[PDB]
RNA sequence: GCCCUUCGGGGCAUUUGGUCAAUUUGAAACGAUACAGAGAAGAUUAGCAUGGCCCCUGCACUAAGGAUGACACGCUACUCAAAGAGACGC
């Protein structure tokens, strides 16, 4: 995914996409030769202080968590909470009305999963 | 006296054969000797005996499976959870502070004294309207 | 709804407290939610800084006052000087005769 | 109970737990450690 | 409450013979002899009626700060300032068991009345619960922040109540080895505890204040007031007699129910003792209750008896209700 | 960070050598406040309160250390805990009413 | 002072080597708060003040801290 | 508006509720005291209430302890047991 | 593979097990090096303790030793004023 190289002193940072590929590349090139007859130093990499790299690694953490949460939650709940589709908004109003216009039930009751529950569930 | 192990880890068979060893290993998190529960697998090709790796104190405080060490609710690696859902439980990780914290937590739990989906929804709200 | 406004037979407004939690926030959960004003916070903080500055001035003045020497030197460092002054403060009322025996060169 | 995702084949489980046949000749596995004493249980009010 | 009339106590017999302060005192269940442990590192067995010295036993290298003669077993237990708790077989007059583990000097020792368990308290700030048979420290009752100076065992919850020199009194559930309560009413070191034999109440004594509590709630029942000295001991009869002995030498006999101080004394020191050496270090009633055995800092065992001559009219109850 | 490592090591060494001297806890917490380390300063004060629970001077120092930094909710929690722990100390009640 | 001077002269020279400060038998007090004892929660919320104290710690400035009459007759 | 004519008339304030209690014959979002919409996980202790309906500050004294622990936290625990207004007859028996 | 059978059938026996052998990058250490110069208010010095996120030798986790084993020696406002008299004060 990323191949930062710093030739001025000649040190590289290689960011793969997977744990398995990263460890395979680490243990596959351990003291392995380059074109020049040298012994490479392939360690793990300390986190970069570059604010961008920190921001994008963070964003990867929240998108991974969001992917798992969206897989865990019902798609109806994800759409009804997501608040980008106007159909989702008016569905949210009508479903979390239960009559009594202007109620707008709390999230702890409206977005509640249980055995009995008060929702379409799934 | 029973491990907290997710169905991903307990191999296939509803009738499972499990071994128990008191002080069988040190916790991978808090480095204190605990009771190891090691079961069989879905193949007799490598007898690794997928076992517990963290103690019930560290299993309970960080709320994760003992074998695979990922979350019980969402199934996240536990740092992904504590960094994206945020707060909950940082947990010390140093030399003496680690066993100090674990010692005090176990002492409290043995002596009786002691909203994840809410922060999941708040995470959804921080991410749905976000822009890089 | 906590305060009820009534008009008596004499024709004046009387506010009656249904609870007892008007003048005091005891027996009232809303005490957990009160925010003090920024001006009052600044006032309290500035008062604390004034007390701290006065204590620092007192410390410096005490150091300067004890740094001035008067009379004979009977010590070798500052801890010895403080101990000898404490000894004086306690024991001058008992060793006056020996004190004048040294100041005189003869009998107690 | 519920878990990370969903359920697949069977829920109820029958588990056979036996102790592990440990080598009689093995010494203790792990070195003991010197940890400072924990904080006390919270003190009571001073009812003087 | 109107107090009962109790006859005043007077000095009967003075027994010299130790060469250090008499810190311990323990009567046989059969009331024939009593045991004085003292600062001359020795345990003396004295006949109770004649007062004569029967035997001297030496096994401690420091002052003997505690004694107990077992009512079920032919044993006598002792503790001392030498970190040692010993079990003496009285069919041989020899130490047969050690109970090791106290980090520093041991101040008190009691036996559980029903089951075969020994509780000791010590300057390492802790009350260790031992098994008699296997000498194994089954419980380490910890939580005090100072010397455990006194201690009582009881047949029902709270089974162990410890009073410490950091002024708190903790009641301990013996099955779990953890405390069920803390009583912080005392201002200074609680040196004395005593349990009433028929009522489910007890008393703790610090300097100046003797507070009376209810088991198991630890409910503050009343306050013996007036004895403005460091209280070392406490002794209740079957007939509701509290004895507060005090390190300045002051003696107070109270009625247990009302709190009325029906007698106040100062004890007397031996020929040769300094006025600083006037003070009560230990006290116990015998099994009958007719005698009070005190041991004092003039190295003296004293026996105190009730005055049979005195009538309810010769010493009327000068109790003024308020 | 290296200077803070030295100072923390020295202060914790003196905590470990004499835990009953209050000046060690006070100087350590004061120094950590001057570094604007508020969680660490609170931790030092709380551990000192573990060692000396009924000390009025320590309680007032921790309350005033959190009042000088405008942590009003923190300090009011502290004052409730202080007058709960020590109900018969007039200074803590006076400080809370003031 | 000598080692610090050499360190700042080599850091500005381009070379950067960190040295093992982790002696055995001793603790690193900078990795995390040593023997943490967090303040107990009371009846007042402290969340915004905790966030503000963390903001103050994060933006703490290293550049603002530096260490190290009358006559004799009348008296 | 007394019984049974509140139709059409909607309450707008808690004083419109009388002394309080939502009116079940008017379909509208009624709140007899106020709104607790969303508190952002405010980590304060929940203010509980004692037996007589007052604020309880022993929840600070009992914090970090088990429920079966005896804790003296009030002035009532300083009173002699006979002089407390709870009871007068106590069985002091083993 | 055996055994029984009324030749349809049936029986006996039933789930082992610690990343693999694979020495850098999952953790062993002294020596050696430049040194160093064994506590108690002058000099030379016998020790016995104390406290533990300091240990070592030892069966001793109820001896003893390791320089009395070493460590200790630094730092120092903060429960905090009151009267009296002075000021081309304000
Ligand atoms: Zn663990
Ligand atoms: Zn798992």
From TrEMBL, chain B:
Q: Which residues bind Zn(2+) 1?
A: 6, 9, 65, 68
Locations listed in the record: Nucleus
Could you say which residues bind Zn(2+) 2 here?
27, 30, 55, 58
Domain of life per record: Eukaryota
Name the protein family. Belongs to the SLT11 family.
Role played: Involved in pre-mRNA splicing. Facilitates the cooperative formation of U2/U6 helix II in association with stem II in the spliceosome. Binds to RNA.
Q: What is this protein called?
A: Putative pre-mRNA splicing protein
Query: What does the record give as the organism's lineage?
Result: Eukaryota, Fungi, Dikarya, Ascomycota, Pezizomycotina
TrEMBL record, chain C:
* GO terms, biological process: mRNA splicing, via spliceosome
Q: Which residues of the full protein are shown?
A: 219 to 326 of 326
Protein name according to UniProt: Pre-mRNA-splicing factor SYF2
| Source organism superkingdom | Eukaryota
Q: What organism is the protein native to?
A: Chaetomium thermophilum (strain DSM 1495 / CBS 144.50 / IMI 039719) (Thermochaetoides thermophila)
Q: Principal localization?
A: nucleus
Keywords assigned by UniProt?
mRNA processing, mRNA splicing, Nucleus, Spliceosome
Q: What this chain does, per the record?
A: Involved in pre-mRNA splicing.
Compartments (UniProt record): Nucleus
UniProtKB/TrEMBL annotation, chain D:
- Indicate where this protein resides in the cell: Nucleus
Q: Where does the record place the modification Phosphoserine?
A: 41
Note down the stretches annotated as region Disordered. Answer: 22-48
Q: Where is the composition biased (Pro residues)?
A: 37-48
**Subunit organization:** Associated with the spliceosome.
Role summary: Involved in pre-mRNA splicing.
Recorded family membership: Belongs to the SNW family.
What is the protein's given name?
Pre-mRNA-processing protein 45
UniProt organism field:
Chaetomium thermophilum (strain DSM 1495 / CBS 144.50 / IMI 039719) (Thermochaetoides thermophila)
- Range covered out of full length: 194 to 241 of 578
From TrEMBL, chain E:
At the top level of its lineage, which domain of life is listed? Eukaryota
Main subcellular location: nucleus
Q: Where are the WD repeats?
A: 15-56, 57-98, 99-140, 141-182, 224-264, 280-314
Localization in the cell: Nucleus
CC terms in the record's Gene Ontology section: catalytic step 2 spliceosome; precatalytic spliceosome; Prp19 complex
Q: Provide the leader sequence positions.
A: none
Record's keyword terms, sorted? mRNA processing, mRNA splicing, Nucleus, Repeat, Spliceosome, WD repeat
Gene Ontology biological-process annotations: mRNA splicing, via spliceosome
How does this chain assemble? Answer: Associated with the spliceosome.
Q: Which family does it belong to?
A: Belongs to the WD repeat PRL1/PRL2 family.
**Functional note:** Involved in pre-mRNA splicing and required for cell cycle progression at G2/M.
This chain's protein is named Pre-mRNA-splicing factor PRP46
The protein's organism comes out as: Chaetomium thermophilum (strain DSM 1495 / CBS 144.50 / IMI 039719)
User: From which residue to which, out of the full length, is covered?
Assistant: 169 to 490 of 496
């Amino acid at each position: 995914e990323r191949i930062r190289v710093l030739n001025n002193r000649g040190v590289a940072f290689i960011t793969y996409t997977n744990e398995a590929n990263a460890q395979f590349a680490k243990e596959a090139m351990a003291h392995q030769s380059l074109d020049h007859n040298e012994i490479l130093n392939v360690r793990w990499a300390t986190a970069d202080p570059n604010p961008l790299a920190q921001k994008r690694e963070q964003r990867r953490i929240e998108e991974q968590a969001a992917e798992a949460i969206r897989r865990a939650l019902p798609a109806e709940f994800v759409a009804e909470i997501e608040g980008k589709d106007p159909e989702a908004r008016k569905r949210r109003k009508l479903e979390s009305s239960y009559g009594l216009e202007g109620y707008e039930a709390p999230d702890a009751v409206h977005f509640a999963r249980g055995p009995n529950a008060v929702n379409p569930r799934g | 006296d029973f491990p907290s192990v997710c169905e991903n880890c307990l191999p296939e068979n509803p009738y499972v054969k499990m071994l128990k060893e008191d002080y069988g290993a040190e916790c991978k998190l808090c480095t204190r000797p605990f009771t190891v529960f090691s079961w069989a697998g879905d193949g007799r090709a490598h007898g690794r005996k997928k076992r517990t790796n963290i103690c019930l104190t560290c299993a309970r405080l960080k709320n994760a499976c003992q074998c695979c060490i990922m979350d019980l609710q969402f199934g996240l690696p536990i740092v992904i959870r504590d960094k994206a859902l945020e707060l909950i439980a940082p947990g010390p990780q140093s030399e003496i502070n680690r066993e100090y914290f674990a010692q005090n937590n176990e002492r409290a739990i043995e002596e009786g004294r002691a909203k994840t989906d809410e922060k999941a929804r708040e995470l959804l709200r921080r991410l749905a309207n976000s822009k890089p | 709804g906590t305060l009820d406004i009534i008009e008596t037979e004499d024709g004046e407004m009387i506010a009656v407290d249904k609870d007892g939690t008007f003048f005091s926030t005891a027996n009232a959960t809303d005490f957990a939610q009160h925010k003090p004003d920024k001006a009052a916070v600044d006032r309290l903080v500035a008062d604390l800084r004034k007390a701290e500055e006065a204590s620092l001035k007192r410390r410096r003045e005490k150091l300067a006052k004890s740094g001035e020497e008067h009379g004979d030197v009977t010590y070798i460092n500052e801890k010895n000087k403080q101990f000898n002054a404490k000894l004086a403060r306690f024991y001058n009322k008992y060793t006056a005769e020996i004190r004048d025996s040294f100041e005189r060169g003869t009998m107690v | 109970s519920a878990q990370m995702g969903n359920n697949t084949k069977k829920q109820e489980r029958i588990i056979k737990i036996v102790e592990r046949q440990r080598d009689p000749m093995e010494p203790p596995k792990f070195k003991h450690k010197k940890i400072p004493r924990g904080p006390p249980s919270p003190p009571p009010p001073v009812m003087h | 409450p109107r107090p009962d009339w109790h006859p005043p106590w007077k000095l009967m017999r003075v027994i010299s013979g130790h060469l250090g302060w008499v810190r311990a005192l323990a009567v046989e269940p059969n009331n024939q002899w009593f045991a004085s442990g003292a600062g001359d590192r020795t345990i003396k067995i004295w006949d109770l009626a004649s007062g004569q010295l029967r035997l001297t036993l030496t096994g401690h290298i420091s002052t003997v700060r505690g004694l107990a003669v077992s009512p079920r077993h032919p044993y006598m237990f002792s503790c001392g300032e030498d970190k040692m708790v010993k079990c003496w077989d009285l069919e041989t007059n020899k130490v047969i068991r050690h109970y090791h583990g106290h980090l520093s000097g041991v101040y008190t020792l009691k036996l559980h009345p029903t089951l075969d368990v020994l509780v000791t308290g010590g300057r390492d700030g802790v009350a260790r619960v031992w098994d008699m048979r296997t000498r194994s420290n089954v419980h380490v009752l910890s939580g005090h922040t100072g010397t455990v100076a006194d201690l009582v065992c009881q047949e029902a919850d709270p089974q162990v109540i410890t009073g410490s020199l950091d002024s708190t009194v903790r009641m301990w559930d013996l099955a779990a080895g953890k405390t069920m309560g803390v009583l912080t009413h005392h201002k200074k070191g609680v040196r004395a505890l005593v349990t009433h034999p028929t009522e489910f109440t007890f008393a703790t004594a610090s300097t100046g204040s003797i507070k009376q509590w209810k088991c198991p709630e630890g409910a503050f029942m009343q306050n013996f007031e007036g004895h403005n000295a460091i209280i070392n001991t406490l002794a209740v009869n079957d007939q509701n007699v509290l004895f507060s002995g005090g390190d300045n030498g002051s003696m107070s006999f109270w009625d247990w129910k009302s709190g009325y101080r029906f007698q106040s004394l100062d004890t007397t020191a031996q020929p040769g003792s300094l006025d600083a050496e006037l003070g009560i270090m230990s006290s116990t009633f015998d099994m009958s209750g007719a005698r009070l055995i005190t041991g004092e800092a003039d190295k003296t065992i004293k026996i105190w008896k009730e005055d049979t001559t005195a009538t309810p009219e010769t010493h009327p109850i000068e109790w003024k209700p308020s | 960070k290296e200077y803070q490592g030295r100072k923390r090591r020295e202060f914790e060494d003196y905590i470990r050598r004499n835990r009953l001297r209050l000046q060690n806890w006070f100087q350590y917490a004061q120094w950590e406040l001057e570094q604007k380390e508020f969680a660490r300063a609170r931790s030092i004060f709380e551990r000192a309160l573990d060692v000396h629970p009924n000390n009025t001077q320590l309680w007032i120092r921790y309350i005033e250390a959190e009042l000088k930094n405008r942590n009003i909710n923190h300090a009011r929690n502290l004052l409730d805990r202080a007058v709960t722990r020590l109900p018969r100390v007039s200074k803590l009640w006076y400080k809370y009413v003031y | 002072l000598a080692a610090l001077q050499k360190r700042r002269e080599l850091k500005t020279a381009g070379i950067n080597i960190k040295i093992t400060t982790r002696k055995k038998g001793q603790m690193d007090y900078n990795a995390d708060i040593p023997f943490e004892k967090k303040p107990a929660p009371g009846f007042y919320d402290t969340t915004e003040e905790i966030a503000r104290n963390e903001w103050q710690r994060a933006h703490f400035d290293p550049k603002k801290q530096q260490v190290g009459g009358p006559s004799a007759s009348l008296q | 508006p007394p019984y049974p004519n509140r139709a059409g008339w909607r309450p707008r304030a808690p004083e419109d509720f009388g002394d309080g209690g939502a009116f079940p014959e008017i379909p509208v979002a009624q709140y007899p005291w106020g709104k607790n919409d969303s508190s952002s996980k405010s980590n304060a202790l929940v203010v509980q209430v004692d037996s007589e309906g007052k604020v309880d500050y022993t929840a600070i004294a009992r914090q970090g302890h088990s429920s079966d622990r005896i804790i003296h936290a009030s002035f009532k625990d300083l009173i002699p047991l006979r002089q407390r207004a709870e009871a007068g007859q106590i069985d002091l028996s083993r």
